[PDB]
Design a protein around this ligand. Sequence first.
Ligand code: MG
Ligand code: MG
Length: 140
Amino acid sequence: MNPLTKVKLINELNEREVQLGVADKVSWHSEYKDSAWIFLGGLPYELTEGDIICVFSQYGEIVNINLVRDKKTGKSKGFCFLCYEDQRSTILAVDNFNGIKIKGRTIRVDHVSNYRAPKDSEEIDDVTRQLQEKGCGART
RNA sequence: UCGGCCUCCGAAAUAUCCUUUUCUAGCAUGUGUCAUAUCCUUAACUCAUUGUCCCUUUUUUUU
Ligand SMILES: [Mg+2]
Ligand SMILES: [Mg+2]
Protein backbone atom coordinates (compact mmCIF):
# COMPACT_ATOMS: atom_id res chain seq x y z
CA MET A 1 0.00 0.00 0.00
CA ASN A 2 1.47 3.22 -1.24
CA PRO A 3 2.07 6.13 1.17
CA LEU A 4 -0.04 8.46 -0.92
CA THR A 5 -3.03 6.37 -0.15
CA LYS A 6 -2.33 6.88 3.52
CA VAL A 7 -2.32 10.61 2.93
CA LYS A 8 -5.62 10.26 1.07
CA LEU A 9 -7.12 8.07 3.76
CA ILE A 10 -6.64 10.69 6.44
CA ASN A 11 -8.13 13.33 4.16
CA GLU A 12 -11.13 11.17 3.40
CA LEU A 13 -11.49 10.67 7.13
CA ASN A 14 -12.06 14.42 7.36
CA GLU A 15 -14.34 14.78 4.32
CA ARG A 16 -16.43 11.84 5.47
CA GLU A 17 -16.83 13.50 8.85
CA VAL A 18 -18.10 16.66 7.16
CA GLN A 19 -20.63 14.75 5.06
CA LEU A 20 -22.03 12.93 8.04
CA GLY A 21 -22.16 16.02 10.21
CA VAL A 22 -20.22 14.72 13.20
CA ALA A 23 -19.74 17.00 16.20
CA ASP A 24 -16.28 17.92 17.40
CA LYS A 25 -16.72 16.33 20.79
CA VAL A 26 -16.93 13.01 18.97
CA SER A 27 -14.54 13.74 16.13
CA TRP A 28 -11.87 11.20 15.24
CA HIS A 29 -9.20 13.51 16.68
CA SER A 30 -10.88 13.20 20.08
CA GLU A 31 -9.34 9.76 20.45
CA TYR A 32 -5.92 11.48 20.44
CA LYS A 33 -6.88 14.35 22.76
CA ASP A 34 -4.55 13.15 25.52
CA SER A 35 -1.39 13.36 23.39
CA ALA A 36 0.42 16.36 21.88
CA TRP A 37 2.70 14.38 19.56
CA ILE A 38 2.38 14.23 15.78
CA PHE A 39 4.08 12.01 13.23
CA LEU A 40 5.33 13.63 10.07
CA GLY A 41 6.25 11.31 7.27
CA GLY A 42 7.56 11.48 3.79
CA LEU A 43 9.72 14.53 4.33
CA PRO A 44 12.42 15.43 1.86
CA TYR A 45 15.81 14.40 3.07
CA GLU A 46 17.27 17.84 2.52
CA LEU A 47 15.12 19.36 5.24
CA THR A 48 16.73 19.86 8.57
CA GLU A 49 15.04 20.41 11.87
CA GLY A 50 15.10 24.15 11.59
CA ASP A 51 13.01 23.77 8.47
CA ILE A 52 10.47 21.47 10.12
CA ILE A 53 10.11 23.81 13.08
CA CYS A 54 10.03 26.81 10.77
CA VAL A 55 6.97 25.51 8.93
CA PHE A 56 5.02 23.58 11.56
CA SER A 57 5.17 26.63 13.80
CA GLN A 58 2.22 28.14 11.95
CA TYR A 59 -0.14 26.44 14.32
CA GLY A 60 1.58 26.90 17.61
CA GLU A 61 4.69 26.57 19.63
CA ILE A 62 6.81 23.49 19.18
CA VAL A 63 8.11 21.96 22.38
CA ASN A 64 10.20 19.06 21.10
CA ILE A 65 11.42 17.61 17.81
CA ASN A 66 12.63 14.14 16.84
CA LEU A 67 13.75 13.86 13.25
CA VAL A 68 15.02 10.33 13.27
CA ARG A 69 18.33 9.89 11.58
CA ASP A 70 20.46 7.03 10.39
CA LYS A 71 22.80 5.76 13.07
CA LYS A 72 25.86 5.30 10.91
CA THR A 73 25.75 8.16 8.45
CA GLY A 74 23.46 10.50 10.34
CA LYS A 75 21.36 11.28 7.29
CA SER A 76 17.62 11.63 7.67
CA LYS A 77 15.26 8.70 7.45
CA GLY A 78 12.54 11.07 6.30
CA PHE A 79 10.27 10.96 9.33
CA CYS A 80 10.16 12.87 12.61
CA PHE A 81 7.92 13.41 15.64
CA LEU A 82 6.89 16.85 16.86
CA CYS A 83 5.44 17.85 20.20
CA TYR A 84 3.33 20.96 20.36
CA GLU A 85 2.74 23.13 23.38
CA ASP A 86 -1.01 23.09 22.82
CA GLN A 87 -2.70 19.82 22.25
CA ARG A 88 -5.16 21.52 19.91
CA SER A 89 -2.38 22.39 17.51
CA THR A 90 -2.23 18.74 16.62
CA ILE A 91 -5.79 18.94 15.32
CA LEU A 92 -4.93 22.02 13.33
CA ALA A 93 -1.80 20.50 11.86
CA VAL A 94 -3.27 17.13 10.98
CA ASP A 95 -6.13 18.84 9.22
CA ASN A 96 -4.26 21.60 7.53
CA PHE A 97 -0.86 20.17 6.76
CA ASN A 98 -1.63 16.63 5.71
CA GLY A 99 -0.72 16.15 2.13
CA ILE A 100 0.93 19.45 1.41
CA LYS A 101 3.94 19.53 -0.86
CA ILE A 102 7.41 20.62 0.21
CA LYS A 103 10.08 20.46 -2.51
CA GLY A 104 7.65 18.50 -4.61
CA ARG A 105 6.89 15.77 -2.09
CA THR A 106 3.66 15.20 -0.22
CA ILE A 107 3.90 14.54 3.48
CA ARG A 108 1.56 12.87 5.89
CA VAL A 109 0.78 14.25 9.31
CA ASP A 110 -1.00 11.95 11.76
CA HIS A 111 -1.70 11.87 15.49
CA VAL A 112 0.68 9.68 17.48
CA SER A 113 -0.50 7.88 20.60
CA ASN A 114 1.66 7.15 23.65
CA TYR A 115 4.89 8.30 21.97
CA ARG A 116 7.80 6.68 23.80
CA ALA A 117 11.01 8.75 24.06
CA PRO A 118 14.51 7.55 23.01
CA LYS A 119 16.79 6.26 25.75
CA ASP A 120 19.90 8.24 26.64
CA SER A 121 21.98 5.07 27.09
CA GLU A 122 23.92 6.00 23.95
CA GLU A 123 26.61 8.67 24.30
CA ILE A 124 26.89 9.13 20.53
CA ASP A 125 26.16 12.87 20.45
CA ASP A 126 25.92 15.83 22.85
CA VAL A 127 23.48 18.13 21.04
CA THR A 128 20.96 15.28 20.97
CA ARG A 129 21.35 14.97 24.74
CA GLN A 130 20.63 18.69 25.07
CA LEU A 131 17.59 18.31 22.81
CA GLN A 132 16.23 15.35 24.79
CA GLU A 133 16.78 16.71 28.30
CA LYS A 134 16.00 20.37 27.53
CA GLY A 135 14.55 20.70 24.02
CA CYS A 136 13.83 23.71 21.84
CA GLY A 137 11.82 26.47 23.48
CA ALA A 138 11.54 30.19 24.16
CA ARG A 139 13.74 31.41 27.01
CA THR A 140 12.77 34.47 29.04
C1' U B 1 -64.87 70.75 34.12
C1' C B 2 -68.21 66.89 32.07
C1' G B 3 -68.11 63.96 26.25
C1' G B 4 -68.22 56.25 26.33
C1' C B 5 -70.18 53.73 18.36
C1' C B 6 -72.03 47.84 17.93
C1' U B 7 -74.48 42.39 20.05
C1' C B 8 -79.30 38.80 14.71
C1' C B 9 -82.23 35.67 11.35
C1' G B 10 -83.33 32.73 6.61
C1' A B 11 -82.12 32.29 1.29
C1' A B 12 -78.22 32.34 -3.14
C1' A B 13 -74.69 24.27 -2.09
C1' U B 14 -75.30 18.78 -1.62
C1' A B 15 -80.56 18.85 -7.57
C1' U B 16 -84.69 17.25 -10.14
C1' C B 17 -88.06 13.59 -12.15
C1' C B 18 -90.66 8.69 -12.84
C1' U B 19 -92.96 3.88 -10.78
C1' U B 20 -95.25 0.90 -6.50
C1' U B 21 -96.71 0.98 -1.43
C1' U B 22 -96.88 3.84 3.37
C1' C B 23 -98.36 8.54 6.40
C1' U B 24 -101.02 12.61 6.27
C1' A B 25 -103.64 17.11 3.78
C1' G B 26 -107.94 18.86 0.86
C1' C B 27 -112.31 18.00 -1.26
C1' A B 28 -117.57 16.77 -3.65
C1' U B 29 -122.25 14.04 -5.44
C1' G B 30 -126.94 11.17 -5.96
C1' U B 31 -136.50 11.77 -6.86
C1' G B 32 -37.83 1.77 -56.99
C1' U B 33 -33.87 5.50 -54.51
C1' C B 34 -30.57 8.92 -52.37
C1' A B 35 -30.80 12.32 -48.37
C1' U B 36 -34.35 14.95 -44.35
C1' A B 37 -38.55 16.03 -40.66
C1' U B 38 -43.08 13.93 -39.03
C1' C B 39 -47.12 10.51 -37.87
C1' C B 40 -48.53 5.50 -36.21
C1' U B 41 -46.93 1.10 -33.80
C1' U B 42 -44.09 -2.94 -31.34
C1' A B 43 -41.15 -5.45 -26.89
C1' A B 44 -46.05 -7.29 -18.97
C1' C B 45 -38.81 -2.90 -22.03
C1' U B 46 -36.73 0.16 -17.59
C1' C B 47 -36.73 4.57 -13.19
C1' A B 48 -30.17 5.68 -11.03
C1' U B 49 -26.21 3.61 -8.27
C1' U B 50 -22.27 2.56 -3.38
C1' G B 51 -19.89 -3.05 -6.35
C1' U B 52 -10.66 -3.48 -2.88
C1' C B 53 -10.01 1.91 -8.99
C1' C B 54 -5.31 2.47 -4.08
C1' C B 55 -2.34 1.75 -8.71
C1' U B 56 1.27 7.08 -7.26
C1' U B 57 7.12 10.47 -3.93
C1' U B 58 14.76 7.41 -3.05
C1' U B 59 9.92 7.75 1.52
C1' U B 60 10.23 3.76 5.51
C1' U B 61 5.96 5.15 13.37
C1' U B 62 11.46 6.43 16.63
C1' U B 63 15.58 2.94 21.64
MG1 MG C 1 -78.09 29.91 -7.79
MG1 MG D 1 -79.22 35.87 -8.12
